[PDB]
Design a protein around this ligand. Structure first.
Ligand SMILES: Nc1ncnc2c1ncn2[C@@H]1O[C@H](COP(=O)(O)OP(=O)(O)OP(=O)(O)O)[C@@H](O)[C@H]1O
Length: 434
């Protein structure tokens, strides 16, 4: 048996293994679980978040282990069950989303193994954990970490329970590391160091220290006009971000007063189609104002935009983020110009203060004028889009400036350094602060 896992044979209420791909932690566990089964009448539940059929489950890998060691002649193998013929030990495999009624009813569970545990939401941990309540029962947990603010990572790494054996492992710890995987992993290290550290060295997605917007604010911000009770009041503003000539997706944002109402992504579109797209959406959303990025490829859109808005009262404006700050000589509320390097920084910061405010209002009770907060309308926007947006905002980053000014990493630099695509929803949403 693979020696790092030695602490698991001892008796802990919580046994957790976290790591990257190819760290041999599914194989090891299936091994230990099998060996335990040959020597004790243990009822072993194997639970996952989603199990739409039996093939999604860890049964195939227990059949493979069983055959690999040569134990085949000891076990009974059916469709949804494995049983040891001597000890009478039993494996069963359910999904926590599919059969919550069945999982509460189960009786006498000694060992529960959650696998692919990173997908397991909080509502499932709350349903499961009490059901494994026999004394000296253990709950075994394997997982690759995604975001640092997901429940599973919170529950065991951040705010651990009592009696936890926490093992960390990478491929750097796998004695039998297949070439099939060594290949995928070398390709990755070279093409995208940042995705590599996520995937293979199992480092979770966390807030950078240079980040201007906290995830928590965004959550707080969601439906914050429904939580504090105030309505969308103001002009409607729409923003289009034309992206580039690359694969990256076009952005459109839009709000009514302090409430954001549409976040749309524009796909498979050139500059003019993309132009026609956002232009119609701004008409559709009854925009009073409509801006767009002209810094790059968007510079020549001007004529096509004003022609689209002919007949309607809609101000169209080419926004340039690299230009000096709006009202740069005005004092800061030391001048504006002293404080921001360009309009791009100015308006991401407007956004963040707005967010931060709402967050203080929603979460600590502190008053703030609804004209100063920001609220995401979840029904309007639709949770898919909403999530894409939140993933992007939280990567917007501060970079050093030699004159003490506030300045952001440019989209090109984020793409180059973070290996992420261009944050065009964020950039579209940012432009709405004007
Ligand atoms: N004890 C072992 N003996 C032989 N090969 C092993 C052993 N442990 C791991 N391996 C090899 O390393 C590979 C990775 O194993 P495993 O699937 O457990 O990794 P994992 O941590 O579950 O990764 P993932 O997160 O992709 O599920 C396996 O396919 C296997 O071929």
């Amino acid at each position: 048996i693979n020696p790092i896992f030695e602490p698991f044979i001892e008796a802990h209420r919580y046994k957790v293994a976290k790591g990257g791909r190819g760290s041999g932690k599914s194989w090891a566990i299936a091994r230990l679980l099998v060996e335990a089964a040959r020597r004790q009448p243990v009822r072993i539940l194997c639970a996952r978040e989603l199990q739409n059929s039996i093939s999604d489950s860890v049964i195939r890998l227990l059949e493979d282990t069983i055959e690999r060691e040569g134990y085949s002649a000891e076990f009974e193998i059916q469709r949804s069950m494995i049983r040891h013929l001597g000890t009478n030990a039993e494996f069963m495999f359910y999904g926590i989303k599919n059969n919550p009624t069945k999982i509460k009813s189960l009786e006498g569970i000694d060992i529960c193994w959650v696998e692919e545990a990173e997908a397991v939401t909080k509502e499932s941990w709350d349903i499961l954990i009490p059901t494994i309540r026999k004394p000296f029962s253990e709950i075994w947990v394997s997982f690759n970490p995604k975001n640092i603010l997901d429940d599973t990572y919170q529950r065991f790494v951040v705010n651990p329970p009592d009696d936890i054996c926490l093992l960390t492992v990478n491929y750097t710890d796998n004695p039998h590391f297949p070439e099939v995987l060594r290949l995928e992993m070398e390709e990755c290290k070279r093409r995208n160091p940042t995705l590599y550290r996520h995937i293979w060295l199992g480092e979770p997605v966390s807030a950078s220290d240079m980040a201007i917007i906290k995830r928590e604010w965004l959550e707080a911000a969601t439906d914050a006009h429904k939580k504090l009770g105030w309505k969308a009041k103001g002009a409607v503003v729409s923003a289009h971000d034309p992206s580039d000539t690359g694969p990256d997706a076009k952005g459109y944002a839009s709000r009514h007063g302090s409430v954001v109402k549409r976040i749309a992504e524009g796909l498979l579109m050139d500059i003019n189609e993309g132009a026609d797209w956002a232009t119609s959406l701004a008409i559709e959303d009854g925009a009073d104002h409509y801006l767009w990025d002209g810094d790059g490829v968007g510079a020549g859109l001007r004529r096509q935009t004003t022609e689209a808005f002919s007949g309607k009262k809609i101000t169209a404006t080419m926004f340039k983020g690299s230009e000096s700050p709006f009202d740069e000589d005005a004092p800061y509320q030391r001048t504006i110009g002293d404080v921001f390097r360009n309009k791009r920084a100015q308006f991401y910061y407007a956004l963040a203060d707005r967010l931060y405010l709402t967050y203080r209002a929603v979460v600590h009770g502190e008053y703030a004028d609804p004209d100063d907060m920001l609220s995401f309308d979840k029904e309007a926007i639709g949770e898919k889009m909403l999530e894409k947006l939140f993933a992007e905002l939280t990567q917007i980053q501060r970079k050093f400036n030699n004159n003490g000014k506030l300045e952001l990493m440019t989209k090109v630099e984020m793409k180059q350094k973070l290996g992420i695509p261009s944050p065009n929803l964020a950039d579209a949403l940012m432009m709405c602060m004007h």
